[PDB]
Amino acid sequence: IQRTPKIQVYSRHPAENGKSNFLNCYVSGFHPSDIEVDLLKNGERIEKVEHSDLSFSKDWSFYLLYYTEFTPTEKDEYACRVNHVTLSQPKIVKWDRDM
Amino acid sequence: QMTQSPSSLSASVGDRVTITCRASQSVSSAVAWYQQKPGKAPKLLIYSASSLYSGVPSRFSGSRSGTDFTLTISSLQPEDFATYYCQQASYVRKTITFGQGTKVEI
Amino acid sequence: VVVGACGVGK
Amino acid sequence: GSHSMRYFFTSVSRPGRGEPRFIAVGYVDDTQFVRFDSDAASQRMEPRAPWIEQEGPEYWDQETRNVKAQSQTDRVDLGTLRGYYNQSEAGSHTIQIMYGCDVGSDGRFLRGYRQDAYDGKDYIALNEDLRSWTAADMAAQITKRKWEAAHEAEQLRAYLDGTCVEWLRRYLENGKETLQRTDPPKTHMTHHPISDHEATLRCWALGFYPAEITLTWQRDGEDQTQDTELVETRPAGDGTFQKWAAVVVPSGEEQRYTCHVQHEGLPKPLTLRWE
Amino acid sequence: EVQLVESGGGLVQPGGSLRLSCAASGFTFSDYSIHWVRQAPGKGLEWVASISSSSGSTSYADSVKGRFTISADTSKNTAYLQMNSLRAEDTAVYYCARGGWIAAMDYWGQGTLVTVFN
Ligand SMILES: *CCC(=O)N1CCN(c2nc(=O)n(-c3c(C)ccnc3C(C)C)c3nc(-c4c(O)cccc4F)c(F)cc23)[C@@H](C)C1
């Protein structure tokens, strides 16, 4: 029918300031497949973000991995913006350093 | 490569004969057993290495012990003296390979 | 390999 | 050591905007290795693994031909199922298909799958005997009749039972150093205070492959499974996975809760405690 | 009910040409493969070449790899085997079979002797 995505913002490696990591926004468990995922740097969209391929879980609910290369620092804050058919307004999930 | 052993075996009526087939790199799905009486088109007996083809008498049965396939005739009858071939198909290479053939004699 | 061209259609 | 090669197809109809969108993905174990997108300009089965690029041009010629034929098939089932449910011809509808095989550590057939789905709900499936279908509703009974009169489950039998097993045992040796590895988790534990009298304990697991892991929060022997956040196993992005479990233990009570990790890449379960 | 009838083989010189025709009848030709198997005199069975009537997939035995070509006319229920550059070892009895959805050639023809004679 229509189930909401479950966003998860994190890093490929443990966050260490000055060392290059990859910011991930793993949205999963949503239907239909039409989703719009933006990776935000201090409230500003990042343009060079790649994404994985549209697969689905055992219960036919999709999942995508949007990743970009970033270097963490104390000043900068990262998030993920997700708009789905089921969500009335875009959902902003801040990148907690502890998740 | 694949060797069917033995190349000939002689047994009387009522005996239990086993023709082995060493399908080293073959799936159990593609291993079938045929019976060619001299100068006649072969006849399918087993497919998927254990399943009797419809109409084949129930004294034929296959198996697999590791990388080695066996055809067993539980109670030989005076109509089961022919040459038996085991096939193996490689879906990767797209080739069916027929074994050398085991001539069951009297 | 993906399934071949055998089938019918839902 | 059981291994599996699964193929996921997602055909989404977009009326009034062109042809239905078709995405095909293949996975040996949890490592994707192929890809197909109906919007990408290549219009070819694109490799997504380093161990799959050793396949000659004939492999990618047949694979592309056999995935576009599924793309065009799903392009006519969307119109067929639309009338089956009698829905308006201006709405988006999704057809999802999954199939594959399970090959044991011996290299032998274990189980073959074939499962379709319309609009996210189950539509039809292939039973464990590989000769009978399990229709899910009253519109899938027509398909189950078309697929029995035309022997759809018997022609497909030689692919799941024979072709997937032979072709999956080709990937496990071509991708020997990638698919046949078990990276143990890099477990650690963190304490995040939320209050003077309440805190939380996060039990981590980073960079483990395959994705199948179990994190449990036992309080002096009894596994809680209550007030225990258990976020889904998430991909790190580099072929490994991450997961963490949390708990809301009160302050000063940290040193009675334990974390156990049961990954097949570990000699024995771990017994993480605080400090 | 299924009948596979093969014809068109006989005396030919080495480096010649034959076209063996397997006239299938009794089944939907587009749903089953058609394999050509040869029985050398005294020796055992040997698979030669294969055709998939739908999707047009061929295969060859690596001893007739570049010499033989299988065709198949779907609206004639007839699969052909064109034999080129025929060697003295190509003489055998050629059976045409039917891949029967079970990874086994359940129905066989009768045989067509091909005699490569110098
Ligand atoms: C929907 C089902 C599907 O996708 N499949 C189509 C049939 N199939 C398949 N593919 C294939 O290449 N061969 C094959 C082999 C293994 C060797 C030589 N030639 C062929 C083709 C060109 C016929 C298949 N072969 C058989 C088969 C075997 O193995 C033995 C005897 C008779 C046969 F017909 C077969 F049953 C299916 C073959 C796969 C891709 C499943």
PDB file of C-alpha atoms and ligand atoms in Angstrom, chain B residues 29-32 34 87-98, chain C residues 1-7, chain D residues 62 66 114 152 154-160 162-164 166-167, chain E residues 32-35 47 49-60 97-106, ligand 1:
ATOM      1  CA  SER B  29      19.716 -31.253 -12.017  1.00  0.00           C
ATOM      2  CA  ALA B  30      21.278 -32.015 -15.400  1.00  0.00           C
ATOM      3  CA  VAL B  31      22.369 -35.627 -14.811  1.00  0.00           C
ATOM      4  CA  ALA B  32      20.172 -38.097 -16.690  1.00  0.00           C
ATOM      5  CA  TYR B  34      19.725 -43.439 -20.841  1.00  0.00           C
ATOM      6  CA  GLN B  87      24.692 -37.237 -19.365  1.00  0.00           C
ATOM      7  CA  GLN B  88      25.835 -34.018 -17.764  1.00  0.00           C
ATOM      8  CA  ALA B  89      25.059 -30.498 -18.935  1.00  0.00           C
ATOM      9  CA  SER B  90      27.138 -27.411 -18.201  1.00  0.00           C
ATOM     10  CA  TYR B  91      24.869 -24.382 -18.429  1.00  0.00           C
ATOM     11  CA  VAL B  92      27.954 -22.153 -18.247  1.00  0.00           C
ATOM     12  CA  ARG B  93      29.609 -23.776 -21.274  1.00  0.00           C
ATOM     13  CA  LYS B  94      26.336 -24.907 -22.923  1.00  0.00           C
ATOM     14  CA  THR B  95      27.456 -28.487 -23.571  1.00  0.00           C
ATOM     15  CA  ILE B  96      25.783 -31.832 -22.912  1.00  0.00           C
ATOM     16  CA  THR B  97      28.354 -34.563 -22.258  1.00  0.00           C
ATOM     17  CA  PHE B  98      27.434 -38.226 -22.699  1.00  0.00           C
TER      18      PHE B  98
ATOM     19  CA  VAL C   1      22.103 -14.958 -15.045  1.00  0.00           C
ATOM     20  CA  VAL C   2      18.604 -13.540 -15.384  1.00  0.00           C
ATOM     21  CA  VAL C   3      15.800 -15.901 -16.332  1.00  0.00           C
ATOM     22  CA  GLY C   4      15.551 -16.480 -20.064  1.00  0.00           C
ATOM     23  CA  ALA C   5      12.754 -15.729 -22.505  1.00  0.00           C
ATOM     24  CA  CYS C   6      10.321 -18.497 -21.465  1.00  0.00           C
ATOM     25  CA  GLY C   7       7.038 -17.598 -19.792  1.00  0.00           C
TER      26      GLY C   7
ATOM     27  CA  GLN D  62      22.846 -12.475 -23.553  1.00  0.00           C
ATOM     28  CA  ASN D  66      17.270 -11.549 -21.334  1.00  0.00           C
ATOM     29  CA  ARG D 114      10.109 -17.121  -7.627  1.00  0.00           C
ATOM     30  CA  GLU D 152       4.997 -21.901 -16.440  1.00  0.00           C
ATOM     31  CA  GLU D 154       7.827 -26.531 -15.330  1.00  0.00           C
ATOM     32  CA  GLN D 155       9.774 -24.485 -17.881  1.00  0.00           C
ATOM     33  CA  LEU D 156      11.110 -22.271 -15.077  1.00  0.00           C
ATOM     34  CA  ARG D 157      12.143 -25.415 -13.167  1.00  0.00           C
ATOM     35  CA  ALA D 158      15.279 -25.946 -15.278  1.00  0.00           C
ATOM     36  CA  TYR D 159      16.499 -22.429 -14.445  1.00  0.00           C
ATOM     37  CA  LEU D 160      16.137 -22.219 -10.657  1.00  0.00           C
ATOM     38  CA  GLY D 162      19.768 -26.125 -12.883  1.00  0.00           C
ATOM     39  CA  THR D 163      20.894 -22.773 -14.277  1.00  0.00           C
ATOM     40  CA  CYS D 164      21.100 -20.667 -11.110  1.00  0.00           C
ATOM     41  CA  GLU D 166      25.577 -23.803 -12.115  1.00  0.00           C
ATOM     42  CA  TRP D 167      25.959 -20.033 -12.610  1.00  0.00           C
TER      43      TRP D 167
ATOM     44  CA  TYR E  32      11.354 -27.329 -26.485  1.00  0.00           C
ATOM     45  CA  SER E  33      14.971 -27.544 -27.566  1.00  0.00           C
ATOM     46  CA  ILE E  34      16.164 -29.814 -30.371  1.00  0.00           C
ATOM     47  CA  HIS E  35      19.505 -31.572 -29.932  1.00  0.00           C
ATOM     48  CA  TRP E  47      26.272 -34.797 -28.438  1.00  0.00           C
ATOM     49  CA  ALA E  49      24.838 -29.429 -31.500  1.00  0.00           C
ATOM     50  CA  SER E  50      21.759 -27.825 -29.980  1.00  0.00           C
ATOM     51  CA  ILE E  51      19.066 -25.267 -30.791  1.00  0.00           C
ATOM     52  CA  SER E  52      16.514 -23.398 -28.700  1.00  0.00           C
ATOM     53  CA  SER E  53      13.549 -22.770 -30.982  1.00  0.00           C
ATOM     54  CA  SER E  54      12.551 -19.673 -29.010  1.00  0.00           C
ATOM     55  CA  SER E  55      15.314 -17.118 -28.267  1.00  0.00           C
ATOM     56  CA  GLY E  56      17.516 -18.715 -30.957  1.00  0.00           C
ATOM     57  CA  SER E  57      20.309 -20.063 -28.755  1.00  0.00           C
ATOM     58  CA  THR E  58      22.743 -22.543 -30.308  1.00  0.00           C
ATOM     59  CA  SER E  59      25.534 -24.732 -28.977  1.00  0.00           C
ATOM     60  CA  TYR E  60      28.232 -26.932 -30.478  1.00  0.00           C
ATOM     61  CA  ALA E  97      16.245 -35.334 -29.752  1.00  0.00           C
ATOM     62  CA  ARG E  98      13.978 -33.003 -27.780  1.00  0.00           C
ATOM     63  CA  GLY E  99      15.008 -31.128 -24.654  1.00  0.00           C
ATOM     64  CA  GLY E 100      11.989 -31.847 -22.520  1.00  0.00           C
ATOM     65  CA  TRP E 101      11.909 -29.146 -19.804  1.00  0.00           C
ATOM     66  CA  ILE E 102      13.614 -31.601 -17.417  1.00  0.00           C
ATOM     67  CA  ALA E 103      17.226 -31.290 -18.636  1.00  0.00           C
ATOM     68  CA  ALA E 104      16.960 -34.584 -20.511  1.00  0.00           C
ATOM     69  CA  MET E 105      16.225 -35.536 -24.124  1.00  0.00           C
ATOM     70  CA  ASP E 106      13.008 -37.446 -23.427  1.00  0.00           C
TER      71      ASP E 106
HETATM   72  C1  LIG F   1      12.441 -19.868 -18.171  1.00  0.00           C
HETATM   73  C2  LIG F   1      13.435 -21.006 -18.174  1.00  0.00           C
HETATM   74  C3  LIG F   1      14.812 -20.554 -18.525  1.00  0.00           C
HETATM   75  O1  LIG F   1      15.155 -19.389 -18.388  1.00  0.00           O
HETATM   76  N1  LIG F   1      15.666 -21.468 -19.007  1.00  0.00           N
HETATM   77  C4  LIG F   1      15.745 -21.763 -20.435  1.00  0.00           C
HETATM   78  C5  LIG F   1      16.325 -23.136 -20.666  1.00  0.00           C
HETATM   79  N2  LIG F   1      17.679 -23.207 -20.129  1.00  0.00           N
HETATM   80  C6  LIG F   1      18.672 -23.860 -20.760  1.00  0.00           C
HETATM   81  N3  LIG F   1      19.681 -23.128 -21.254  1.00  0.00           N
HETATM   82  C7  LIG F   1      20.686 -23.712 -21.912  1.00  0.00           C
HETATM   83  O2  LIG F   1      21.621 -23.060 -22.366  1.00  0.00           O
HETATM   84  N4  LIG F   1      20.687 -25.107 -22.095  1.00  0.00           N
HETATM   85  C8  LIG F   1      21.733 -25.756 -22.843  1.00  0.00           C
HETATM   86  C9  LIG F   1      22.772 -26.410 -22.194  1.00  0.00           C
HETATM   87  C10 LIG F   1      22.885 -26.416 -20.701  1.00  0.00           C
HETATM   88  C11 LIG F   1      23.725 -27.042 -22.980  1.00  0.00           C
HETATM   89  C12 LIG F   1      23.590 -27.019 -24.350  1.00  0.00           C
HETATM   90  N5  LIG F   1      22.581 -26.414 -24.990  1.00  0.00           N
HETATM   91  C13 LIG F   1      21.649 -25.792 -24.258  1.00  0.00           C
HETATM   92  C14 LIG F   1      20.515 -25.121 -25.008  1.00  0.00           C
HETATM   93  C15 LIG F   1      21.036 -24.432 -26.246  1.00  0.00           C
HETATM   94  C16 LIG F   1      19.445 -26.136 -25.346  1.00  0.00           C
HETATM   95  C17 LIG F   1      19.646 -25.876 -21.627  1.00  0.00           C
HETATM   96  N6  LIG F   1      19.718 -27.176 -21.855  1.00  0.00           N
HETATM   97  C18 LIG F   1      18.737 -27.958 -21.395  1.00  0.00           C
HETATM   98  C19 LIG F   1      18.910 -29.398 -21.697  1.00  0.00           C
HETATM   99  C20 LIG F   1      19.887 -30.157 -21.054  1.00  0.00           C
HETATM  100  O3  LIG F   1      20.687 -29.578 -20.103  1.00  0.00           O
HETATM  101  C21 LIG F   1      20.041 -31.496 -21.365  1.00  0.00           C
HETATM  102  C22 LIG F   1      19.239 -32.073 -22.321  1.00  0.00           C
HETATM  103  C23 LIG F   1      18.268 -31.334 -22.988  1.00  0.00           C
HETATM  104  C24 LIG F   1      18.133 -30.006 -22.662  1.00  0.00           C
HETATM  105  F1  LIG F   1      17.190 -29.283 -23.304  1.00  0.00           F
HETATM  106  C25 LIG F   1      17.650 -27.418 -20.687  1.00  0.00           C
HETATM  107  F2  LIG F   1      16.669 -28.217 -20.232  1.00  0.00           F
HETATM  108  C26 LIG F   1      17.584 -26.081 -20.455  1.00  0.00           C
HETATM  109  C27 LIG F   1      18.611 -25.258 -20.938  1.00  0.00           C
HETATM  110  C28 LIG F   1      17.898 -22.469 -18.877  1.00  0.00           C
HETATM  111  C29 LIG F   1      18.622 -21.161 -19.156  1.00  0.00           C
HETATM  112  C30 LIG F   1      16.577 -22.248 -18.169  1.00  0.00           C
END
